[PDB]
Write a protein that binds this ligand. Sequence first.
Ligand code: HPA
Ligand code: HPA
Lengths: 338, 338
Amino acid sequence: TIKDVAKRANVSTTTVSHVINKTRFVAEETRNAVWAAIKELHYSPSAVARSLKVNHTKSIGLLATSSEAAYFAEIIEAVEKNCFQKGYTLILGNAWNNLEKQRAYLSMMAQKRVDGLLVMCSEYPEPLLAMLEEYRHIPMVVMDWGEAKADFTDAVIDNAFEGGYMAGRYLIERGHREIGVIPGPLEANTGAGRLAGFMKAMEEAMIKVPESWIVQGDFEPESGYRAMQQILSQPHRPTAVFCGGDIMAMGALCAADEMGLRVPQDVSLIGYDNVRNARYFTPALTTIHQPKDSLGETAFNMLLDRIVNKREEPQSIEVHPRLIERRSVADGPFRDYR
Amino acid sequence: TIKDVAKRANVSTTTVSHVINKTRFVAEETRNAVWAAIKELHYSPSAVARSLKVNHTKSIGLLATSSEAAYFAEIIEAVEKNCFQKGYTLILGNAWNNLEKQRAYLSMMAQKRVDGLLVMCSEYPEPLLAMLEEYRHIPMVVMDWGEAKADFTDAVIDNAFEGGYMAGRYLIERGHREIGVIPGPLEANTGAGRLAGFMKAMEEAMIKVPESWIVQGDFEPESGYRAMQQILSQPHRPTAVFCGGDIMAMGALCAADEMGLRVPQDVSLIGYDNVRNARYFTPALTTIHQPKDSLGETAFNMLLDRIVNKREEPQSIEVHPRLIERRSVADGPFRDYR
DNA sequence: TACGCAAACGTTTGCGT
DNA sequence: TACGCAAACGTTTGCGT
Ligand code: HPA
Ligand code: HPA
C-alpha cells in the first residue's frame, strides 16, 4: 500500500517514503502530490513493516504485578505519560506474581520486540531473577528493588527504609510509646523495607514492639481491616499504629470505626504512600508520601537512555519519601515529657 | 535468525517454522534437533516479521480516558485479563479527553496495526465521533455509550438510567423527600444518564429538586468535597444525597465529617459504582454496583468475534446495575407514613 | 514419507545519475 | 538538482518431489 500511494502520485515509493519521513529534500509539487494521494487513498503507513527494517518498535513493555491497586495505578499512569510524550507505545502486563504468568508475558514481550522493559514485580525469587537474566539483552529497569539485586539492570530505589524510620520517629515525637504495626508482605521491599526502617527508630527509642502487636497485611484493604481488628481486639492495645500502606490503612480506619473507636482520638494512625486520595480519607490521612510520578519518569528516563545512548552499564537512582501531616495522628501520653 | 536456527539444525527454515508452529508433521529426530538449536541459539521468534506475513498482530488497543481512576482502573484490569488469556497483547492509551491526544493515539494505533480497538472516552463530541469513523476499518467497540451513537461500532450499554432510577427509588422508599444530587459531567453517559434516571423517579414521586441542591461533580474526590460543602453550607439542607460516583462520594463523606455532620445520622448518602473498596469507606458505602468485570469481558468478546468470525454488523449488549445496601443510608422522616 | 525452494508481506536506504 | 532501482529486514506457505 505504499506502492499504491507511489503510483497515484506517479513517483517512486522511495520518494513517498522520503516525504513521509522528511528524510531528504523533495520538490513541493512532488511532496504535495504525494500528500494528495496519501490522503485520498487514506494511507496509514505500517509500523510493523517499518520496525522490520529499522529494528525498533518504539514500544515499551511494563511487566507489572497488578494495575487496579491505587499505588500501582498511579505509577503506571505516570509511565504512560512519559511514553506518550516521547512517542513510545505502552504494553501493559499483569503477572499477579505468578511465575508462569511472568514467564509468559516476558516471552510475549521479547517476540513483540519491545525497545525496553519496565519491571515492577513486587517480589523477586531467584527463579524470577533467573528468568529476568535470560533477557538481559533487552534493555530494562526494575522500579521496585531495595538495593541492586542484580547487575544486568537499571534500578530506581525508593529509600523505603528511610520512610519507615520517618514514620516511627514521628510517632515517637508525638508522645507515643505503645505503637503497633501492620506491615505489607515481607517478601517485598515496600514491605520489609518499610518495616525495618520503622523498627530501627523503635530500637533507637528503646521501644519494644510486642509481637501481638504486629500483624501482616497484603496491601489490600481487607488485610488492614482484619489486622486493626486483631490489634484493638486485645486486653492491652497500643495508642498509635503504623500501617505499611494507605489502602490497608483505609481498611484499618473502617474497622476502628466499626468498633466504635475514634481516630485519632482513641487510636492514632499513620500510613504510607500518600495515594492520590488519602487526603479524602476520614479522617484525612497522615502519611509518608512516595514520589510516584518521579519514580515513573525516572524509570522511563534511565530506559530511554540505555535504549538511545546505548548504555551498557547498570545504573541506579534513588528517590525520597517525605512525611505528610494530615489529621489522623494526635499527641501521645509522653508528648509533654521530652 | 530463524536462518541461524535452521543451519545449526541443518534443515530448512521451512522446517524450523513448521516445528515452531506445529503446522505440519515433523520427524522427532528432526523436531528435536530444531529445538536443540532453538535453545542453544537462544531463539526468540520475531512477531513483527510474523505479523508482517500473517497480517495480524494479535494485539489490542485500549483508547481510554485515564487509568488512575478507581472506576477505570478496575475495568482496564478486567480487559487485560481477557487479552492475556486469549493470547492478545494490550496497548494502553490515555487521551485525557484531549482531541489532539485522541487523534494521536488513534493514529499511533492503526500504524501499529492493532487487531481491534477498545474505546472508552467518556465524552463523545461530533469531532470525536468523526475521527472514530475514519477508522471504521479497524474493528472496535465503544464501552461507554448510553444508546448506539453510531453504526460503525459495537456497543456495550450499562443502563446507567435504570441505575439512577434505582438510587432515587431507594431514597424514596427509606423515607426521604428532601434529596440532593451531585452528578458527574453532563457530557458523559455515566453522568447525564445516571442523573436523569434519578430525576425520573423524583418526578414520579412528585419530589422537586431545588436547583440549589444539585451540584456538578467531575468524578474526582475534590469535586465531591466541594459539592457536599456547598450543599450542607445552606439554610435549608436535604436529608439525603445522591452522589453520581463513589470516589466523589468519598469526597462528600470527608467534608460532612469536617463540618461535624454525621453520616448517615445527619445526612444519608448513596453513591454509584461500587468500586472495589467502597465497602471500606467510613461508613461502608451504600451504592449502585456497576458490573465492571462483565462490562470488560463483554467488550473483549464482541471484539474478538468481529475480529475472528469477521462480523460486519454492529452489535450492542446491555449490562445491568444493581443496588448494594451498606451502611450509609438511614430511614427518612416519611418512612413510617407509606 | 518427510521435507525444500523461492516468492511474498511492506517498508527503508544505498548508490546511482 | 531532484529523484529511482533493487536489495534487504525475518518470516510463512505454496507447490514441489
Ligand atoms: O505492593 C504494593 N501494593 C500496594 N500498595 C503498595 N504500596 C507499597 N507497596 C505496595
Ligand atoms: O467517568 C467516570 N470517571 C470516574 N468514575 C466514573 N464512574 C462512572 N463514570 C465515571
